[PDB]
Amino acid sequence: IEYDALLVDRFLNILQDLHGPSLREFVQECYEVSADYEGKGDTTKLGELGAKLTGLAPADAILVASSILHMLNLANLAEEVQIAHRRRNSKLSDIEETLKRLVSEVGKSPEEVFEALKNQTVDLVFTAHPTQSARRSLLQKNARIRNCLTQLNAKDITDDDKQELDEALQREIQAAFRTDEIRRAQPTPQDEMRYGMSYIHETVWKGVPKFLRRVDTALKNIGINERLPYNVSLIRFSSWMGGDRDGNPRVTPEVTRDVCLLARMMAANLYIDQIEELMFELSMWRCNDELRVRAEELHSSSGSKVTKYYIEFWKQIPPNEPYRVILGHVRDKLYNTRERARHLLASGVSEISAESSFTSIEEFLEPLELCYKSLCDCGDKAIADGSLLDLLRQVFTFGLSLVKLDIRQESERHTDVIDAITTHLGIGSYREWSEDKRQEWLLSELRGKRPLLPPDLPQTEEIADVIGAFHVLAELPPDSFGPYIISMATAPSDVLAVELLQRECGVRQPLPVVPLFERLADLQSAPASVERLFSVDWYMDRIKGKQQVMVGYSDSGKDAGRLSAAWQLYRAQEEMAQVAKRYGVKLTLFHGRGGTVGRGGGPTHLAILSQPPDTINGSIRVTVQGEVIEFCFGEEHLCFQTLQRFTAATLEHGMHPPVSPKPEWRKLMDEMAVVATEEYRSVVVKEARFVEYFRSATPETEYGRMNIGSRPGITTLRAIPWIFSWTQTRFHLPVWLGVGAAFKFAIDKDVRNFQVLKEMYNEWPFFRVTLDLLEMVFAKGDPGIAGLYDELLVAEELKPFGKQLRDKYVETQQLLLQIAGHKDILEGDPFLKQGLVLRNPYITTLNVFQAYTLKRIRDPNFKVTPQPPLSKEFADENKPAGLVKLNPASEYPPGLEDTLILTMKGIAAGMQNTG
Amino acid sequence: IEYDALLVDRFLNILQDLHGPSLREFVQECYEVSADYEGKGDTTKLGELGAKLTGLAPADAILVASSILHMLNLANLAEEVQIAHRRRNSKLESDIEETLKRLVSEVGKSPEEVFEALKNQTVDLVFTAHPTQSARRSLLQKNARIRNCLTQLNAKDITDDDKQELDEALQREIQAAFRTDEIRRAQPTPQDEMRYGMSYIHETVWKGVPKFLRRVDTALKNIGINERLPYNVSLIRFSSWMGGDRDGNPRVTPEVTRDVCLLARMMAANLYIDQIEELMFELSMWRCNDELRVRAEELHSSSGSKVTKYYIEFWKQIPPNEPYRVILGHVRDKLYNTRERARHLLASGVSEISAESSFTSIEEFLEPLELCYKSLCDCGDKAIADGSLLDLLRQVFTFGLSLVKLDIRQESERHTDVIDAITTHLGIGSYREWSEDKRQEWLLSELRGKRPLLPPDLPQTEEIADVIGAFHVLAELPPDSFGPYIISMATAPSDVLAVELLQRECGVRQPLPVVPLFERLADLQSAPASVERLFSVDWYMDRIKGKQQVMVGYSDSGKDAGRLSAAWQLYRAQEEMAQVAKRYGVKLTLFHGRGGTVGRGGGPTHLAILSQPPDTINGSIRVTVQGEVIEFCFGEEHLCFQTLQRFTAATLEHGMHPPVSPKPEWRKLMDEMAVVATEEYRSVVVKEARFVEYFRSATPETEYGRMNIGSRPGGITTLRAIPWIFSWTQTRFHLPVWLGVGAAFKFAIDKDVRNFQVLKEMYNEWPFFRVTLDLLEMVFAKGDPGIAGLYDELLVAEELKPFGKQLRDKYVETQQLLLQIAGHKDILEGDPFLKQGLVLRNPYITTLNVFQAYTLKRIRDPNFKVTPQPPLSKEFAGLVKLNPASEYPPGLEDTLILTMKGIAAGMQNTG
Numbered sequence A: 001i002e003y004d005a006l007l008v009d010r011f012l013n014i015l016q017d018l019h020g021p022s023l024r025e026f027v028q029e030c031y032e033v034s035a036d037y038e039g040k041g042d043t044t045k046l047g048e049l050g051a052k053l054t055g056l057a058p059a060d061a062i063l064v065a066s067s068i069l070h071m072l073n074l075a076n077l078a079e080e081v082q083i084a085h086r087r088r089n090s091k092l093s094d095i096e097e098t099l100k101r102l103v104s105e106v107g108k109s110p111e112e113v114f115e116a117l118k119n120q121t122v123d124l125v126f127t128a129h130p131t132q133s134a135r136r137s138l139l140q141k142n143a144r145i146r147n148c149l150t151q152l153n154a155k156d157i158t159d160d161d162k163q164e165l166d167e168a169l170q171r172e173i174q175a176a177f178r179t180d181e182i183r184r185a186q187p188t189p190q191d192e193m194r195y196g197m198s199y200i201h202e203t204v205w206k207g208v209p210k211f212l213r214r215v216d217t218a219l220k221n222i223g224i225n226e227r228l229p230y231n232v233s234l235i236r237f238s239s240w241m242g243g244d245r246d247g248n249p250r251v252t253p254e255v256t257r258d259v260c261l262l263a264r265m266m267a268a269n270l271y272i273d274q275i276e277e278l279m280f281e282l283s284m285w286r287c288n289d290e291l292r293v294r295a296e297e298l299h300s301s302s303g304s305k306v307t308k309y310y311i312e313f314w315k316q317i318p319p320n321e322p323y324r325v326i327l328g329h330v331r332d333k334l335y336n337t338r339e340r341a342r343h344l345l346a347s348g349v350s351e352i353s354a355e356s357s358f359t360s361i362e363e364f365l366e367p368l369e370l371c372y373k374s375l376c377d378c379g380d381k382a383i384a385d386g387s388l389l390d391l392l393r394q395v396f397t398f399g400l401s402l403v404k405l406d407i408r409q410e411s412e413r414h415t416d417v418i419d420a421i422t423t424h425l426g427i428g429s430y431r432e433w434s435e436d437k438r439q440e441w442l443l444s445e446l447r448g449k450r451p452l453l454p455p456d457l458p459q460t461e462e463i464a465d466v467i468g469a470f471h472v473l474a475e476l477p478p479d480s481f482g483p484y485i486i487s488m489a490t491a492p493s494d495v496l497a498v499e500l501l502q503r504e505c506g507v508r509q510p511l512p513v514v515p516l517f518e519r520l521a522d523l524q525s526a527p528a529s530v531e532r533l534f535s536v537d538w539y540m541d542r543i544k545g546k547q548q549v550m551v552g553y554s555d556s557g558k559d560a561g562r563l564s565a566a567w568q569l570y571r572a573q574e575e576m577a578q579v580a581k582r583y584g585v586k587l588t589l590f591h592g593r594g595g596t597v598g599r600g601g602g603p604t605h606l607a608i609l610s611q612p613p614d615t616i617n618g619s620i621r622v623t624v625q626g627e628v629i630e631f632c633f634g635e636e637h638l639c640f641q642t643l644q645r646f647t648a649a650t651l652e653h654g655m656h657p658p659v660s661p662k663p664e665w666r667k668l669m670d671e672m673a674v675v676a677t678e679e680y681r682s683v684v685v686k687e688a689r690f691v692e693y694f695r696s697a698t699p700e701t702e703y704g705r706m707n708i709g710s711r712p713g714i715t716t717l718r719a720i721p722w723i724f725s726w727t728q729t730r731f732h733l734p735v736w737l738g739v740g741a742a743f744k745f746a747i748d749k750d751v752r753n754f755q756v757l758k759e760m761y762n763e764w765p766f767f768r769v770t771l772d773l774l775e776m777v778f779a780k781g782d783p784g785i786a787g788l789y790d791e792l793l794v795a796e797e798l799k800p801f802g803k804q805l806r807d808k809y810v811e812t813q814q815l816l817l818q819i820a821g822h823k824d825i826l827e828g829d830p831f832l833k834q835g836l837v838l839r840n841p842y843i844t845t846l847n848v849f850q851a852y853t854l855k856r857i858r859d860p861n862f863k864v865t866p867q868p869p870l871s872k873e874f875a876d877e878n879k880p881a882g883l884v885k886l887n888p889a890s891e892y893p894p895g896l897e898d899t900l901i902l903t904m905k906g907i908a909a910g911m912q913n914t915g
Numbered sequence B: 001i002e003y004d005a006l007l008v009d010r011f012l013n014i015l016q017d018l019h020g021p022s023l024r025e026f027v028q029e030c031y032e033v034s035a036d037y038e039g040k041g042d043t044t045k046l047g048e049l050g051a052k053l054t055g056l057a058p059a060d061a062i063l064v065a066s067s068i069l070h071m072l073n074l075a076n077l078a079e080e081v082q083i084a085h086r087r088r089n090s091k092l093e094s095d096i097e098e099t100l101k102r103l104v105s106e107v108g109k110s111p112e113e114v115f116e117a118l119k120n121q122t123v124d125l126v127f128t129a130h131p132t133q134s135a136r137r138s139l140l141q142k143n144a145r146i147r148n149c150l151t152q153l154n155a156k157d158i159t160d161d162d163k164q165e166l167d168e169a170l171q172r173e174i175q176a177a178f179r180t181d182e183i184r185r186a187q188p189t190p191q192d193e194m195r196y197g198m199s200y201i202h203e204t205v206w207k208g209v210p211k212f213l214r215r216v217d218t219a220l221k222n223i224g225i226n227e228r229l230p231y232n233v234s235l236i237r238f239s240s241w242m243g244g245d246r247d248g249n250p251r252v253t254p255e256v257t258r259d260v261c262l263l264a265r266m267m268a269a270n271l272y273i274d275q276i277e278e279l280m281f282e283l284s285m286w287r288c289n290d291e292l293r294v295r296a297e298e299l300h301s302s303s304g305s306k307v308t309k310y311y312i313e314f315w316k317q318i319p320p321n322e323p324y325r326v327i328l329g330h331v332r333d334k335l336y337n338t339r340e341r342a343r344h345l346l347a348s349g350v351s352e353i354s355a356e357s358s359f360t361s362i363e364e365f366l367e368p369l370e371l372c373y374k375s376l377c378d379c380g381d382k383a384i385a386d387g388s389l390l391d392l393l394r395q396v397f398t399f400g401l402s403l404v405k406l407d408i409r410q411e412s413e414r415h416t417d418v419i420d421a422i423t424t425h426l427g428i429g430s431y432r433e434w435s436e437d438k439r440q441e442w443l444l445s446e447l448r449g450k451r452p453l454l455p456p457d458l459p460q461t462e463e464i465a466d467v468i469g470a471f472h473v474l475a476e477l478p479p480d481s482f483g484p485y486i487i488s489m490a491t492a493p494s495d496v497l498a499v500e501l502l503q504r505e506c507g508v509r510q511p512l513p514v515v516p517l518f519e520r521l522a523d524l525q526s527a528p529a530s531v532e533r534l535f536s537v538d539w540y541m542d543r544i545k546g547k548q549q550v551m552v553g554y555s556d557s558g559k560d561a562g563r564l565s566a567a568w569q570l571y572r573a574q575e576e577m578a579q580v581a582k583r584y585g586v587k588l589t590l591f592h593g594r595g596g597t598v599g600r601g602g603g604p605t606h607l608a609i610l611s612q613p614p615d616t617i618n619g620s621i622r623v624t625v626q627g628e629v630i631e632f633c634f635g636e637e638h639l640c641f642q643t644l645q646r647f648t649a650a651t652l653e654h655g656m657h658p659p660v661s662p663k664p665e666w667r668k669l670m671d672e673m674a675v676v677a678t679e680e681y682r683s684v685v686v687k688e689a690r691f692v693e694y695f696r697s698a699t700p701e702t703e704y705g706r707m708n709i710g711s712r713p714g715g716i717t718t719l720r721a722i723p724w725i726f727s728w729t730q731t732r733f734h735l736p737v738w739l740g741v742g743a744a745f746k747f748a749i750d751k752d753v754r755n756f757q758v759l760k761e762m763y764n765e766w767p768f769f770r771v772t773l774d775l776l777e778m779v780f781a782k783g784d785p786g787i788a789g790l791y792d793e794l795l796v797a798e799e800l801k802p803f804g805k806q807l808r809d810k811y812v813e814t815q816q817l818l819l820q821i822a823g824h825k826d827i828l829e830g831d832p833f834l835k836q837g838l839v840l841r842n843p844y845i846t847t848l849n850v851f852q853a854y855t856l857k858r859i860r861d862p863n864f865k866v867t868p869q870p871p872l873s874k875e876f877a878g879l880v881k882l883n884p885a886s887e888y889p890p891g892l893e894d895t896l897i898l899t900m901k902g903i904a905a906g907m908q909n910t911g
Ligand SMILES: O=P(O)(O)OC[C@H]1O[C@H](O)[C@H](O)[C@@H](O)[C@@H]1O
Pocket: A311, A312, A313, A314, A315, B135, B136, B137, B138, B139, B184, B192, B195
């Protein structure tokens, strides 16, 4: 309430200084009018907003939309600092609290909590899902605005530093305001990778050694007189950027080669900085004999020649500084590692050998562990637990490639390739065969040692990309890659085909093949698919007791309902874990969940809690998708929270699991799921005029204009634009549609079922968490806004259909609140609700702004009354506005497209979610 | 006794955990007896302390001497943090804002007069590798970390987990410094002492200059100036002697100078690259000039749409609607060539990359940056241009393409050596035997002549070769990497003219300005005459173009005469030289060669600037920052901000609000005691032959070279100033600093009893006389004749201690009259804390004083029997064998060196 009024004060001053007082008063007037809608429910205020926002000059319209976008963004920044400040004060969920509670209350011993941590691993998978509506220029400014705002509220600073810190804050807000918010060109898969990797640099790299040090501090406070072994990778980091090519033909085999090399050069660069700092630190002389002989071998083998362009340690290092002798050799091999990567990237050859550089992580760890052992054996274990222990943990966590790259392609793309092989040879048509026929042939071919892939094989452009990707996988080192994920996996022949196409393409060390069950049917037959794979002798010899399976929270919610998909994913996880335990396999589940509730999003410790008991056991992978990367790792503060949340919630779920559902609960969920999906699909799939309404009532067709990603009826739509359209209108149709029908069906089947619905919400964590998130969504909902879009853009014949959907909204919210114990939305949580009451008037302004602009774009002859210009800069019509001409040759009249894009970015900013 | 007790309580714990409890309380028992010597004066206890320091095992003697050294170091770190925390509280020694307010309101200058003064001010801080830094760079690195942990451990809002983790880091780095070899086993190269000095330019000075200029701008705002200080105003410059001063150092070769010049140019390129690609991300605005628009479209068109796959950011071509990124992207690639071209010249001697591909001048670099600045301003975005862009522009004007400008220094006789070889080989005669008037007319005829002089047939020694080869290297390297050519022990205008000719006859196509360094008393007395002779010859006036720079040495003048007479002639030299310069219309810039110790002209920066005569600075001054002082003034960020502010504020106040000139009575008295003080000084150091034998007996002067501080490898005038001061500082006697002052004061009182009130009047009113005496009492605070009397009783011969006690009593005498002139009850009355910093350190200093004298005894006296006692350290002799071939028996050299570093740490000064 004070951080917010501070930054908004600075912005409105910058606005008045640059464009005059009229543009400032207008923006403030919009807030007051919208504040009366939000505060009273006066639907006539929306017509008042519509009146003002129509008729503006093209430049003023862009400036109005951009100002509100920046103020909503500033409001977000003001809240991120406020919660950080409150979390700090609350310490004057935690990993030390979780360790204490796990020893004192649930009664586990410190040693079995120690043993649990040493076997835990949470892999966080960065993906470039097109959800980051803010360009990196603007995000970079947000870091400095938050940094200024934090230092500005220390009780330590002088009046003069206070005066300079605000001047820097005002100039950073101005720098963002005068930047083109609209990304005028589509990004490159290499650009998306760099955006993800930037968080590995600025936050994650030094983040996880600081977090691993806290884990040791927590272990010491529960009696463990021992550090967590540095080979324990509590957190690992993977990437989809450059590897996932599902429906992205711009992700080429060249692109994957690029990101693998560029990441290896980045890793060498960060290792260089750490080794140079370590060279200066370890100036001791006492060392083990094994290092004493190694330091004398290196000092003798290398001639006493100088390197005049080295800034430190440019002469031969004396042997009485053994740790510098050993690390100087590591530093020299690292420089070769960096530029050998540099050369391969520029032109795929290098003068620098592989023997002169680091090729394996054992090669890199060997001298570093020698220094650690050496220091310990002289009683210098305290010195070895400093920067050296940090680095040793960084190598086990990041390796030579910084992150491991998953590869993802869809199943029918492999079937296309194998059918080509069988058709080109004499065998027949792999596409026409039954599923069991395919499993029979693939196993006869994997067992047979005769090659299959013919050199003269005719290839489409799609078949060439699939094979070329596998060729790229064979060229680059195996430690640069994670698994090969099958999008749209349905049956074991999908997994076996990739296993064969891998070997038939020269992958000497094949990646693990992970199926991604994304739709409802695929998830229903998922434990059956896993079982028959586990019953094949060849496949069990290949996986060696380790299996990974991915579940897709996005496309499954889009196929069925939210409630149905949520339930089926619970069962798929549960029955697959049972299949794997019967067959003696350690299953690792890969949760592909996005930022929004509709795509599997929600607080980390709550999403882990809703997962079936005894299906994690210290081995889990989760996708951090697009804008979520900023949400979790945009600043050191946040990275420490994100690392602590995943580590604590994964450890607690292991030793202290949640409850399994009662048999009556399961039966109710199974029947409610059927009713939910039928109700969902009756509106989304069966209703003929749905997509016509859906394209009228939402800004779906404009999502691509934001230029977020590299990807060049409802069946064809992606999940992110799907959720996006219904989050922009604050309707959130896919997130709740069906839950109303399932709840009614349950209580009209039996009135007592209302009492078991209340028992499930109070006792079943999966149920509480699922329905708690639905409440949080209805908090961010407003049927009045959906009604405004219906009125301005939806044809009259479809208006009764829209009102039907708003009726299902109101009855679903009525229910869910009554199954919960609450009077109204968000009782026992007022801070988030306070953050809503302050952001909402500016979102409502943009909602009215977006709707009326869409009307001006679709109806080119919608009459408006021109208003006098508001900005002093573009007030005189001599020559056109630079702001308007930033989009030359637009498909829409001047200013409308830019105005529309800014409302989409601003609503996403206020909603704190894009899709 | 807060941070102090903290820092040692951990060290004492780390010591016991590694070496056992007996060694722990042995060093505490050493504090026991010495603390009671300081709290009594019992000379009995020093012999008692010496009794058990003697018999220690060789490995234990090293550990004890090192343990005291690390605790005295920790006591200094705790003092540094306490001071910084106290200064922080005093804002919740003048601020730059307070100085601007005082100059406007009290003194009554207009804010525009203050503004116009600041725009014309330049304080050049000259980093030198003078051999004063006793600590290894590895140890200095850990001292910064220990101060960092100790600071964060006292924050107002840190958790208990954050506190205990910062504690573990504090201990593991107290232990990492303890288990490091404190002794530099090999003598450093000149290219290494360049590294040491340039490390501070990286870690605090680079970002500190634009931060301080930022505070100068807010100060200007709060006195009514609604304008930023122009970015082309170089309020603070930085020069270097490292790799440039070669006087007395034959290891500073012409190749060494070439190295540090190109290496600095590479470091400059590295820092600019980081700032540029950082600025690349920041300047994302689209509004720009007409001139920037045309520029951005010119380069976007002329640049093919190639990509650079190894660029982390901006790896594709940049769109022309991001104009600032287009220009800065070209700047970035031109800087990458500049860095690599310097790398190639440094490794080999040639580069594939052209000069046309890189930045060869400040103007070439500034043109794109100033275009962006004017562009942002013309679009109403001045507030953006004043962010990172202004900081970088200020960094260019402050540091340039070489980061620091190098100064070259060689002594006058080395130049006369070469010129004598020329005339002898040509048959002109002997330049060495000509009178100075003849020398002037000959060189002036050769400078006016067009015929070459230096024959390639010239027979050369190694020294005459070093002089010419150094001039050759000056001709090869770019002019913007050099400052002035400085002449050590300059005496007369021919020394200046000799260098002027040698420069031109060695092919220096744009000659360096020649600066005389007047280091000895006789040279300073004739210095206004030498400057007037140079200002009166038409050739030299046409060359210098109304600007002259003269260096005055504080180290060698205090060694020639006394401290009183040096400081007074230095006052008169500056005073009369400025009067000569004003008569001839020349702007004179004084270069003050000040050291760390008071004996070599050291002291608080704002106090030293106040001591200088009025109307001698006027916004143009250069000051040396020598060796260990570089750490004192720039070791951490708040120290750099403090140093820049003192120099800026003191210099600015001196110009518009000068000190008072001395009264005629004050001058005459000052002149008369200068004669009496010098006569008293020369009578004990020059006259009396046994002074040398006493000196080398009672001080550890003969082992100062064993610390391997610098790269510098007979009689008494042959000793250099730093070992001279270092010797009397370790014995806590400080003879050179106060010698002639005692005879001077009594002479004034006995000549006339009324002079006693005149001495008091000068102390109350005259800033020069007040600062000079105030620095003396601080020296006496760190002085103790008992320790000097110790060293005598063990090491000096019986015939000489009558002489030693005579000096000991003129110490006590001068201390008496100095306190009576100051009107102070005791030493350091109103400075309570930094006197309580003495009461904590001095027990430890006294144990090492006894350790030094007794160790020196067993070295010079191989006969002195000592009874070995059982070892203390549970580790034991690997620690001994870090010194393989020592001239002395096992452990005594290492113990003697650890001693020297310890006292240097406790005294907070080396030489
Ligand atoms: O040896 P120290 O004084 O601790 O300095 C540490 C290092 O500093 C620089 O890098 C020098 O070039 C090295 O030769 C030296 O070893």
